[PDB]
Amino acid sequence: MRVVVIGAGVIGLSTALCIHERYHSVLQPLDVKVYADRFTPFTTTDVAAGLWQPYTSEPSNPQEANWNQQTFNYLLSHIGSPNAANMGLTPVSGYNLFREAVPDPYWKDMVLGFRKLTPRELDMFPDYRYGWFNTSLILEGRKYLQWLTERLTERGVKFFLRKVESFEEVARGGADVIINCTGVWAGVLQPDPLLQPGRGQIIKVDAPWLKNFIITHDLERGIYNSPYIIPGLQAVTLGGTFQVGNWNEINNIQDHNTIWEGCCRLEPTLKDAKIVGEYTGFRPVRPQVRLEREQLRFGSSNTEVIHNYGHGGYGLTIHWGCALEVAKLFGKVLEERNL
Amino acid sequence: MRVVVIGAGVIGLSTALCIHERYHSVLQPLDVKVYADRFTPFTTTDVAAGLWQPYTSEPSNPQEANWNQQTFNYLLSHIGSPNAANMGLTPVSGYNLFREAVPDPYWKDMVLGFRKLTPRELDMFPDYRYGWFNTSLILEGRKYLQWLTERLTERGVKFFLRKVESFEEVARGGADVIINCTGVWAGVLQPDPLLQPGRGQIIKVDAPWLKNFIITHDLERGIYNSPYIIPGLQAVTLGGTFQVGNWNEINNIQDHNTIWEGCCRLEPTLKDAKIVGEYTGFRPVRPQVRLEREQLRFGSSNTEVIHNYGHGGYGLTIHWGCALEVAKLFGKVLEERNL
Numbered sequence: 001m002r003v004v005v006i007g008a009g010v011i012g013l014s015t016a017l018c019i020h021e022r023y024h025s026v027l028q029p030l031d032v033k034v035y036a037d038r039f040t041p042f043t044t045t046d047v048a049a050g051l052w053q054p055y056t057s058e059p060s061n062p063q064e065a066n067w068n069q070q071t072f073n074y075l076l077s078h079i080g081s082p083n084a085a086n087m088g089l090t091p092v093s094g095y096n097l098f099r100e101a102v103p104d105p106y107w108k109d110m111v112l113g114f115r116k117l118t119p120r121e122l123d124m125f126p127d128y129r130y131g132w133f134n135t136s137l138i139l140e141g142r143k144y145l146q147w148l149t150e151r152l153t154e155r156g157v158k159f160f161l162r163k164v165e166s167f168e169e170v171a172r173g174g175a176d177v178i179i180n181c182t183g184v185w186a187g188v189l190q191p192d193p194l195l196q197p198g199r200g201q202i203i204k205v206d207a208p209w210l211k212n213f214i215i216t217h218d219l220e221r222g223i224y225n226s227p228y229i230i231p232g233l234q235a236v237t238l239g240g241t242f243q244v245g246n247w248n249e250i251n252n253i254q255d256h257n258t259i260w261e262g263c264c265r266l267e268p269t270l271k272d273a274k275i276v277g278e279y280t281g282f283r284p285v286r287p288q289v290r291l292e293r294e295q296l297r298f299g300s301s302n303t304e305v306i307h308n309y310g311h312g313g314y315g316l317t318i319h320w321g322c323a324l325e326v327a328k329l330f331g332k333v334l335e336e337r338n339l
Numbered sequence: 340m341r342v343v344v345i346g347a348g349v350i351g352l353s354t355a356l357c358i359h360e361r362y363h364s365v366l367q368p369l370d371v372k373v374y375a376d377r378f379t380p381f382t383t384t385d386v387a388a389g390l391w392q393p394y395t396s397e398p399s400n401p402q403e404a405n406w407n408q409q410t411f412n413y414l415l416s417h418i419g420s421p422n423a424a425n426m427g428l429t430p431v432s433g434y435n436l437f438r439e440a441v442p443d444p445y446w447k448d449m450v451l452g453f454r455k456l457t458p459r460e461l462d463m464f465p466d467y468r469y470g471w472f473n474t475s476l477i478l479e480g481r482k483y484l485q486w487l488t489e490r491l492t493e494r495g496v497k498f499f500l501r502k503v504e505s506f507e508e509v510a511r512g513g514a515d516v517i518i519n520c521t522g523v524w525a526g527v528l529q530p531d532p533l534l535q536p537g538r539g540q541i542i543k544v545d546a547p548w549l550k551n552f553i554i555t556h557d558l559e560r561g562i563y564n565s566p567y568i569i570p571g572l573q574a575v576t577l578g579g580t581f582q583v584g585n586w587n588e589i590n591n592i593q594d595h596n597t598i599w600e601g602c603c604r605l606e607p608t609l610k611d612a613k614i615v616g617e618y619t620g621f622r623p624v625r626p627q628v629r630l631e632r633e634q635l636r637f638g639s640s641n642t643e644v645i646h647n648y649g650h651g652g653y654g655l656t657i658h659w660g661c662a663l664e665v666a667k668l669f670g671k672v673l674e675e676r677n678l
């Protein structure tokens with residue numbers, strides 16, 4: 001059948017692939033196309049630091065932790081393959097610093113080697129007073145996008161640089177099912193006051209001697225302003241902002257300065273990191289991820305729509321779960337058609 | 340008094356500095372010079388991977404462990420300073436893989452976060468079956484040499500490219516006290532059948548996505564013969580050879596191939612690492628480090644000599660301890676002179 005994936009960010013691409021991988025033998029003509037107004041390096045995904053780490057507290061939608069876990073495993077499993085880095089993946093170990101004692105993350109056991117930092121360790125960071133240590137993964141957006149793309153491409157999924165106007169339009173196109181993976185911009189296709197830009201700017205700097213991530217946490221200053229540093233495949237991400245509702249898409253000087261000053265403070269060696277770029281992107285914020293089926297009817301047209309958006313600042317971290325999920329629904333959609 | 344340090348590797352330089360740092364104030368006319376036939380990038384030190392980690396086997400002498408510990412601390416203490424990386428220092432976390440259960444290292448508590456790997460972790464490198472995980476430091480030779488050098492230089496220590504032919508000789512120059520830090524070549528100045536070249540060749544490769552060290556152990560094949568990988572400040576060290584008695588100083592193709600093949604197995608992603616260089620060096624092997632005073636008399640000449648050599652494959656790892664030690668003796672030498 002006719003399937004159209006709207007979006008070419010981590011979400012759509014995975015999902016496209018995932019659906020395609022799982023039902024191309026179960027269905028001869030299984031046409032997949034991907035429509036997107038932006039492709040890497042242009043998506044939000046392309047800006048993401050890429051570290052796998054959910055949020056401190058358990059998700060309102062309890063199922064989401066499983067998605068996080070499944071993602072971590074699919075990733076871990078590729079650790080050992082000669083392709084992992086080509087896939088934009090590698091293990092990274094690091095610190096979560098806090099200014100006071102804090103309960104253990106629900107994912108404490110999903111990552112490798114979770115443990116509370118000792119005082120000697122804490123002295124490596126004179127500001128913080130409590131924290132954790134653990135090993136995890138880095139799944140770099142831009143790279144993963146390129147991989148997913150090559151994979152899809154070989155599987156014959158076709159891409160089109162298009163701005164979808166209305167689901168109707170697509171549907172009118174011929175779409176049988178439509179997978180909505182439009183991230184923060186999902187609103188335009190259908191309003192959702194729940195969804196919102198969680199803006200973040202970051203500085204990319206060249207500072208190879210930094211081998212571990214350090215993610216600082218402020219307790220009376222929202223989730224993002226604290227400075228954070230995340231070593232990636234080829235550069236380091238200096239970070240520190242999460243402004244909900246800001247739609248400004250240009251990097252701002254003060255943000256640049258606060259990020260720079262904050263990190264330089266947490267890691268004085270940055271005093272010599274060469275800055276290689278700055279970026280800003282919109283985390284698709286929503287209280288809970290929207291991943292559900294929805295029948296849209298336009299006259300005589302019976303087109304199904306599966307939503308998968310609102311992954312906030314953890315899209316990479318949870319991408320695979322949701323993908324598996326959409327697949328399951330896409331299956332039911334297929335089952336209702338008796339295949 | 341006139342003091343002459345023979346050697347400009349990690350050992351001499353530290354020692355020079357260290358002595359100078361403590362008695363420049365106290366000792367009246369204090370004149371330190373460093374004589375060496377090789378300077379970075381030419382020393383053995385310049386080839387060292389730079390990871391702090393003593394041998395897995397217990398200390399040969401007691402002092403060796405304290406020296407190791409003192410070194411680790413002096414290093415840790417600079418973690419937080421904005422100079423550390425300029426000093427060639429940074430934390431690095433990593434794995435020690437074994438093919439069977441093995442007792443815990445005596446340094447288990449000197450490093451940060453020592454812990455036994457879990458099975459999931461073990462899965463990352465299938466061939467092994469047991470191992471550890473811990474965080475430590477990297478003190479890169481070439482860089483540390485340059486730092487020590489600048490420091491010494493500012494303190495006014497003078498350097499001379501020269502080949503000492505006999506302690507006597509140098510004694511003749513009016514040298515008051517000589518510090519022998521000639522590494523494997525210490526023999527020539529005075530025979531020591533205990534000392535021997537522990538040859539090691541390594542490939543430097545560009546593979547930034549590798550953030551942690553992995554040090555394999557073949558228990559039958561000896562120490563540092565198994566493949567090992569150690570991410571450094573700007574490149575990665577592929578390693579794997581420790582041939583005692585080999586004085587060949589040219590990189591050998593076979594070695595290059597076994598190193599390359601071994602690491603490529605342990606870490607398949609290396610398939611795409613660009614090789615940036617190969618190097619070979621002589622670990623100054625000796626059953627116990629030689630660090631002791633020795634009066635050499637030549638006619639009417641009463642010149643003291645303090646030896647500090649034979650640090651094997653753990654020179655960086657233990658440099659500071661020994662330095663502090665030589666200092667203490669140099670002090671006694673000064674005390675016997677009533678200052």
Ligand SMILES: Cc1cc2nc3c(=O)[nH]c(=O)nc-3n(C[C@H](O)[C@H](O)[C@H](O)COP(=O)(O)OP(=O)(O)OC[C@H]3O[C@@H](n4cnc5c(N)ncnc54)[C@H](O)[C@@H]3O)c2cc1C
Nearest residue numbers: 007008009037038044045050051164183200314315316317
């Ligand atoms: C600064 C920052 C750091 C981050 N770091 C991390 C991290 O370390 N770990 C982690 O897991 N997550 C992180 N994230 C979150 C991650 O970036 C997002 O969760 C993820 O990128 C969301 O993916 P997406 O495909 O849903 O959105 P995007 O990647 O933005 O995908 C949007 C896609 O839909 C298209 N599109 C939308 N509407 C239409 C339309 N009407 N017609 C056509 N095409 C349309 C766009 O062209 C694009 O193809 C970070 C995000 C930011 C901003």
Ligand SMILES: Cc1cc2nc3c(=O)[nH]c(=O)nc-3n(C[C@H](O)[C@H](O)[C@H](O)COP(=O)(O)OP(=O)(O)OC[C@H]3O[C@@H](n4cnc5c(N)ncnc54)[C@H](O)[C@@H]3O)c2cc1C
Nearest residue numbers: 346347348376377383384388389390503522539654655656
């Ligand atoms: C392949 C390899 C990997 C290593 N990795 C590590 C590691 O990861 N961690 C660690 O702690 N250690 C490591 N080591 C060990 C470390 O390299 C040595 O322990 C350390 O370099 C010894 O320092 P040194 O100054 O005593 O010898 P060198 O660095 O070789 O110093 C020799 C100096 O004395 C001079 N000299 C000698 N004789 C004379 C003379 N007659 N006249 C004038 N000058 C003279 C030479 O020019 C030079 O100045 C490694 C070594 C090798 C070979």
Ligand SMILES: N=C(Cc1c[nH]c2ccccc12)C(=O)O
Nearest residue numbers: 049053054055056215228239313
């Ligand atoms: N996910 C990241 C990195 C990050 C900063 N603070 C965090 C707290 C919990 C989990 C992740 C993070 C981002 O910049 O969006």
Ligand SMILES: N=C(Cc1c[nH]c2ccccc12)C(=O)O
Nearest residue numbers: 388392393394395554563567652
């Ligand atoms: N010191 C190193 C690295 C190394 C390889 N095997 C080891 C066992 C114990 C301690 C260190 C190592 C060197 O290459 O000399």
Ligand SMILES: N[C@H](Cc1c[nH]c2ccccc12)C(=O)O
Nearest residue numbers: 341342343370372512513514515
């Ligand atoms: N080299 C001789 C004597 C001398 C002067 N300064 C030092 C320092 C270290 C050893 C010897 C010397 C000279 O300068 O006449």
